Each structure stands twice: as C-alpha cells, then as structure tokens.
Amino acid sequence: APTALERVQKEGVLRVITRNSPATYFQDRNGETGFEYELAKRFAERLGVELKIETADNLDDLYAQLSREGGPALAAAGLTPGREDDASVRYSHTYLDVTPQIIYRNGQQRPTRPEDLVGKRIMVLKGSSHAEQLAELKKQYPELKYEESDAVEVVDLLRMVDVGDIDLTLVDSNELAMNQVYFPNVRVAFDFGEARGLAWALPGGDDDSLMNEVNAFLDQAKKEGLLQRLKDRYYGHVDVLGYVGAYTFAQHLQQRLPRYESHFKQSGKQLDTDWRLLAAIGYQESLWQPGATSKTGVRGLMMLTNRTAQAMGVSNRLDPKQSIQGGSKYFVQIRSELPESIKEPDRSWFALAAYNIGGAHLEDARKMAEKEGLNPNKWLDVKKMLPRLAQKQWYAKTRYGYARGGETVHFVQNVRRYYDILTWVTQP
Ligand SMILES: [Cl-]
Ligand SMILES: [Mg+2]
Ligand SMILES: [Mg+2]
C-alpha cells in the first residue's frame, strides 16, 4: 500500500488544514497570507506538489478532519501539543516557542497570579491548550469558572476583553502581539506557565514517511532563517513597533482612521491602488493627523513639500482630502516612473523609498547595489545599500551625494508593517 508521502506525490497535492485567521491563513482580494500558509506553501514546493488549504471552524473540527478517512495530510494551525500522547495524533518537531498569557482590560485591576483568576468572567477557545491549562488550575482552585467557545477565533476573544464583554482571556503570546494593534485596551496580565513549542499535526499510526519530510523541512526552514522572517512579519508587531507603539496604533485605528478612510478609499479607487498602502503611508508620515507640521518643509497628513503640493495641484496641505489625494497621486506617479526592470511587489517598496528619499538618491543606491554584485531590481538588496548614502565614505563618490538612507529603510519597513496590519483587519 502507498505510504502517506507516496499518496501526496501521486495526487500531486498536499492538503493542509488550518484556521481562517491572519495568524494562520487569510484571504484578501490581493492574495493569500499567513504564517502557516507561507510555511506550508514552502513545504509543498519542497515536495514538488500543489498546496491545497482547508479550514476548520474550531480545534475539535480540525482534529476530527485530520483523523477521518480521506482527510488532509497535516494540520498547520499554531497547534500546541497536548501534555499526554493520544494515538489519534502525532506532532512534528516544534517550530516556534510561545508563552501563554492572561489578557485583561486596561482600567480593571490586573490579576497577578493564577489564584487571582477566580471570580472572573473568562473565555477561551474550546479544545485549546489554554482550556486545558484552566481545567488543570480548576483542580487546584475549585471555585475557578471559565467558559469555552467553539465558534470564534482568538481575535474575537481579545475583542471581548477590549470592549468589556469578558474580564479575561488566555492566549498565546504571538497572538497577543499580532492583535495588540487592534485593541487599545487589551493588556498582558502575566505569563501563565512556561513557553510551549508549536507543532504541525499528522494523523495517527506508524507511517513516518511524511513526518520525516516535515521534520527535515522545518529544520531547513530554521536554518535558512525562514521561520524567523515569518515570525517577524506576522508576530513581530510589538517587537518592532514597541508595546506602547502597538496599542497606540490601535487607538489611532479606532479614533483617527475613520475620519479619513473614505478619502483613502476614493484615492485608491481613482488611482487603482490599494487604499491600505496609502493609509499606511499616512500613518508613518503623520499618524493620521492632517494638521501635523515639521521643521523640514513637510506638512499635512501625507507630509507633502510645497514643491510636491504645487506639482500635484494641492492648494492646501492642511486639508486632509487634498493631502491624501496629492500624496497618493505622487506615490503612484513615482511608482510608474521606476525602471521597467523593477517588478511588483518590489516595485511598490522601491516607490516607498523614493517617496521618502527621492528617485535620484534611490538610483544611486541601485547603482551601488549593482557595483557590489547585488540585484538592483530586488528591494532586499538595494535596502542594504541605502544606509551607506548617509556615510561620507560612500556618498562622496555618488552622483547625488548625501542622503538619509537609514531613515528611508525605517520608513519602508514601517509602512510595509502598517500595510499588513490594515490588510489583516477583521470584522466583529
Ligand atoms: Cl522593507
Ligand atoms: Mg469561524
Ligand atoms: Mg513506529
């Protein structure tokens, strides 16, 4: 009989079951994203087969699907292995360490120890490792009460805390970090238990043909830095923006963006460009404040110079609609003017750089990249060269000389993150 691996390669498809969530697998008109999605995609390519994603509405369903005849090959869904073996499931090597965290609402008193969880309105996901943590705690503290939901995602639990529907939830640290940017009142109470490793799940039994390939792959994904890069993209908001930066973004998302969203959407439509990228530029530039000023000659929501404003037909840089229109028009123009050899998505990152530093200085960075034997059409290569424009050792011999290329790298990295964050917004 064919092995699990032989079946996948025979069918030419790897079926992977996950959850429908930005953290794992997420559909947007532009495409598909997610930590587990990207990892599974790379694994499918390693096997030389197509990736077919399936989703489950809760963990019980996910595990039921995995154990059914004709079920998927594996589950990739930020799964924490149970503390005892069950014949129905086998786990891969772990690929990410996460810390369970009790989450509370700023404005209420912070529980500091497990004992403080008694007398609280608590909700967690049914079938989760977090539910088992509370079940175990309840044996020690019988008065402990908590509820389990089998019909929501982690984003929904955190929303419940944020708006005061519940007092506390318990989630993995990476999910908190990913969602802190949406919920301004959510705070970590304390770390509950030691760090746990996430793992992919495979069906039960003695067939190790696919498992050995999974573990070989995860080892390689770690070595090549893939796991780190994915971790930083999806789960790195607090690491990069800072904790205060993250919940402050949440506040601004809630209070400021609604005043200007319609403008960004209108500009995006008439310019045929993703409005969330425009909004992301707006946040990096002014934190969505149309009255924002500077001492460097830029002003307004999109931080336009007088020269750019004039060129774009902006008569009032302090008018949010005008600033958004002009700034968006300028970004699209810049992007259109880039050398044809620069393809999307890199093309958009180059355009962000040019928005910040100008096309002339950017071209110097591209020429430096080529000279160093790097690809001048790949953003990640040119990004290495930009900071050198700030150092006389390098810029003195460039055509256009000194430029703050370090700030440009920061600008693009931040805008790309804000862009991700806005794309991953989900509705209540
Ligand atoms: Cl970047
Ligand atoms: Mg659902
Ligand atoms: Mg065996």
Side-chain angles (χ1 to χ4, degrees), residues 101-108 110-111 158 161-162 167-169 171 176 180 183-190 243-244 246-248 250-251:
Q101 298 180 316
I102 293 291
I103 308 307
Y104 79 110
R105 190 185 202 212
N106 198 44
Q108 288 187 298
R110 181 181 68 86
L158 293 171
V161 175
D162 192 62
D167 296 324
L168 309 170
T169 190
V171 305
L176 184 278
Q180 184 68 77
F183 302 119
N185 301 320
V186 146
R187 297 287 187 281
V188 179
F190 60 90
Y243 190 65
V244 175
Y247 68 65
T248 297
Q251 181 180 344

Side-chain angles (χ1 to χ4, degrees), residues 136-299:
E136 284 300 305
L137 182 63
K138 186 169 172 62
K139 290 173 182 177
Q140 178 175 11
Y141 298 105
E143 291 298 305
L144 181 77
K145 297 174 181 176
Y146 65 96
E147 306 171 37
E148 297 169 308
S149 177
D150 76 337
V152 304
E153 301 288 317
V154 174
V155 62
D156 300 308
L157 298 175
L158 293 171
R159 184 177 288 107
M160 290 172 193
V161 175
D162 192 62
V163 308
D165 288 340
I166 68 183
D167 296 324
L168 309 170
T169 190
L170 174 59
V171 305
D172 285 331
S173 54
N174 61 314
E175 285 281 15
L176 184 278
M178 190 169 197
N179 282 280
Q180 184 68 77
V181 294
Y182 302 128
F183 302 119
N185 301 320
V186 146
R187 297 287 187 281
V188 179
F190 60 90
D191 298 345
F192 187 18
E194 275 169 7
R196 310 285 296 282
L198 303 179
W200 286 357
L202 280 72
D206 298 325
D207 192 345
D208 294 334
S209 64
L210 185 62
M211 181 68 88
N212 289 342
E213 287 303 313
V214 164
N215 287 336
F217 164 72
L218 291 177
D219 287 347
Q220 186 81 317
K222 186 180 203 304
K223 254 171 67 80
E224 297 175 348
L226 177 57
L227 288 173
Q228 184 67 49
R229 288 189 306 272
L230 292 176
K231 172 184 182 287
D232 288 340
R233 184 185 179 183
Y234 292 95
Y235 309 146
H237 295 341
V238 171
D239 289 332
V240 173
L241 303 181
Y243 190 65
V244 175
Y247 68 65
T248 297
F249 176 94
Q251 181 180 344
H252 294 160
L253 178 60
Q254 186 181 87
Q255 299 297 321
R256 295 183 183 175
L257 184 57
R259 299 168 195 150
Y260 316 113
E261 179 169 298
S262 178
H263 297 144
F264 285 119
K265 282 181 170 176
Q266 185 172 83
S267 289
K269 206 170 189 229
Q270 58 199 0
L271 295 169
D272 199 46
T273 305
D274 194 315
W275 74 266
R276 290 159 303 183
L277 178 56
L278 307 178
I281 291 165
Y283 192 78
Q284 175 59 24
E285 289 289 26
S286 71
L287 301 306
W288 298 319
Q289 303 177 103
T293 63
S294 82
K295 291 178 164 191
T296 62
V298 292
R299 188 179 306 177

Side-chain angles (χ1 to χ4, degrees), residues 295-315:
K295 291 178 164 191
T296 62
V298 292
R299 188 179 306 177
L301 205 155
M302 298 293 277
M303 284 292 161
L304 309 177
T305 63
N306 199 41
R307 290 176 189 176
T308 299
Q310 176 185 41
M312 294 299 95
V314 171
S315 62

Side-chain angles (χ1 to χ4, degrees), residues 250-398:
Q251 181 180 344
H252 294 160
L253 178 60
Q254 186 181 87
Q255 299 297 321
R256 295 183 183 175
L257 184 57
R259 299 168 195 150
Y260 316 113
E261 179 169 298
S262 178
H263 297 144
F264 285 119
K265 282 181 170 176
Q266 185 172 83
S267 289
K269 206 170 189 229
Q270 58 199 0
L271 295 169
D272 199 46
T273 305
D274 194 315
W275 74 266
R276 290 159 303 183
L277 178 56
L278 307 178
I281 291 165
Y283 192 78
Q284 175 59 24
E285 289 289 26
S286 71
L287 301 306
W288 298 319
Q289 303 177 103
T293 63
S294 82
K295 291 178 164 191
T296 62
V298 292
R299 188 179 306 177
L301 205 155
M302 298 293 277
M303 284 292 161
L304 309 177
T305 63
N306 199 41
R307 290 176 189 176
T308 299
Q310 176 185 41
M312 294 299 95
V314 171
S315 62
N316 183 7
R317 288 186 291 166
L318 295 177
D319 184 86
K321 174 166 164 174
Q322 286 196 34
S323 183
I324 289 167
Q325 285 176 328
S328 298
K329 188 177 172 179
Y330 184 66
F331 169 76
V332 175
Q333 182 174 113
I334 277 174
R335 191 170 62 184
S336 297
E337 288 172 2
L338 289 169
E340 199 209 286
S341 60
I342 305 174
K343 311 307 189 190
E344 293 285 4
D346 296 70
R347 194 174 180 83
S348 285
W349 314 151
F350 276 96
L352 292 172
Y355 189 94
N356 178 265
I357 205 176
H361 293 300
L362 181 62
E363 182 61 10
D364 278 0
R366 294 187 67 241
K367 290 201 147 179
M368 271 180 54
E370 175 71 36
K371 175 164 293 309
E372 291 296 313
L374 303 178
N375 189 338
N377 298 308
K378 293 296 180 180
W379 169 242
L380 290 181
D381 279 10
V382 175
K383 174 184 177 177
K384 309 190 198 184
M385 298 296 97
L386 273 166
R388 293 178 176 183
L389 293 179
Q391 298 169 291
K392 187 169 186 180
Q393 152 176 4
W394 297 99
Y395 73 63
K397 291 166 66 63
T398 63

